[PDB]
């Protein structure tokens, strides 16, 4: 299977994907995040964060309160399954994670934790 995916987060506050499917043959999965546009990280930063559907709101709330200095992610948040760093336009960051942290029959959500972004910048991830 392919065990990676290229995702874009643009100045329109949109991920070019609303749904990700991870193949079971994969032991590891990689997300290559880029950011088309021209806006800076302090006002249009984007990160790719993964958690269970149950944990999303909390990760987003606690991340918002963490500040730009911490990439808007609560330090050592156990609910975060995997995450890229917070990037601005023109930047790139990739993250690889263990697929064994996922199971079938559970809804996972990927989103950006920059203040307010998750309202539009979010999507589903499923192991299949």
- Point out which residues bind Cu ion (CB under 5 A): 46, 112, 114, 117
| 121 assigned binding-site residue | yes
Our CB check for Cu ion shows the closer of 108 and 114 to be 114
Please tell me whether 35 is known to bind a ligand. Answer: no
Contacts of 43 (CB under 8 A, 6+ apart): none
Q: How far apart are CA 123 and CA 20, in angstroms?
A: 8
Cβ neighbours around 48 below 10 Å, total = 27
| Residues counted in the chain | 128
Smaller CB distance to Cu ion: residue 29 or 114?
Answer: 114
Of the candidates 19, 72, 75, 73, the one whose C-alpha atom is nearest the C-alpha of residue 41 is 72
Q: Which is nearer to Cu ion, 18 or 28 (CB)?
A: 18
Task: In angstroms, give the least distance from the CB of 39 to Cu ion.
Answer: 10
Return the number of the residue (46 or 83) whose C-beta is nearest Cu ion.
Answer: 46
Taking the complex as a whole, the smallest distance from the CB of residue 29 to Cu ion amounts, in Å, to: 21
- Helix or strand or coil: residue 117? helix
26 annotated binding-site participant: no
Residue carrying the six token digits 């930063």: 45
DSSP 114: S
Least Å distance, CB 117 to Cu ion, is 4
**Residues tagged in the binding site annotation for Cu cation:** 46, 112, 117, 121
**Residues tagged in the binding site annotation:** 46, 112, 117, 121
């Amino acid at each position: 299977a392919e065990c990676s995916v290229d995702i874009q987060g643009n100045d329109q506050m949109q991920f070019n994907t609303n749904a990700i499917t991870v193949d079971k043959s994969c032991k590891q999965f990689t997300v290559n995040l880029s950011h088309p546009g021209n806006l800076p990280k302090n006002v249009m930063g984007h990160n790719w964060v993964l958690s269970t559907a149950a944990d999303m709101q909390g990760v987003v709330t606690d991340g918002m309160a963490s500040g730009l200095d911490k990439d808007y992610l609560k330090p050592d948040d156990s609910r975060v399954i995997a995450h890229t760093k917070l990037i601005g336009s023109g930047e790139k960051d990739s993250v690889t994670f263990d697929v064994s942290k996922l199971k079938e029959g559970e809804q996972y959500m990927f989103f950006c934790t920059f203040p307010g972004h998750s309202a539009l910048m979010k999507g589903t991830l499923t192991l299949k």
